[PDB]
Design a protein around this ligand. Sequence first.
Ligand SMILES: CN1CCN(c2cc(NC3CC3)nc(N)n2)CC1
Length: 154
Amino acid sequence: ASRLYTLVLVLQPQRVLLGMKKRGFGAGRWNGFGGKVQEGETIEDGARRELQEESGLTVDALHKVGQIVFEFVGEPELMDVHVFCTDSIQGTPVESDEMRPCWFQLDQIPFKDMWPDDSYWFPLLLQKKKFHGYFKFQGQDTILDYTLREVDTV
Ligand SMILES: CN1CCN(c2cc(NC3CC3)nc(N)n2)CC1
């Protein structure tokens, strides 16, 4: 069994939008915007909802770019993260209770202050290639196993 999550990257020709997580799971790391998918909403709907709640931004179209499955040792549910990207946003990003947003140049992505898996799959994201990933974590800092492959359909 798995639980559905979303992650949204606003990726524009020269820059990417990340949020510093201010509380809760992953506090203290820069990440895309996202969260749990609710009963009664599509994955895409959930992605737009979390983007709006965390940054105030709305989007015309979200594109599926990846799926990443996480195992945390000792936790029964796998995390099934559906990753989306967009290049056209509506509005200016603003800070929320959960996220403090900032733009980063593509050669200055703060990988040391991100989830360790990002260093593995972000290159594929930046090359506009679709991917399937799997990461086994012990705790929040240690990757024990992983797989990563490019796909034709996410
Ligand atoms: C609600 N959030 C959305 C984003 N998400 C993650 C996780 C992640 N790896 C960690 C599981 C080990 N890496 C990125 N880039 N995003 C976690 C749950």
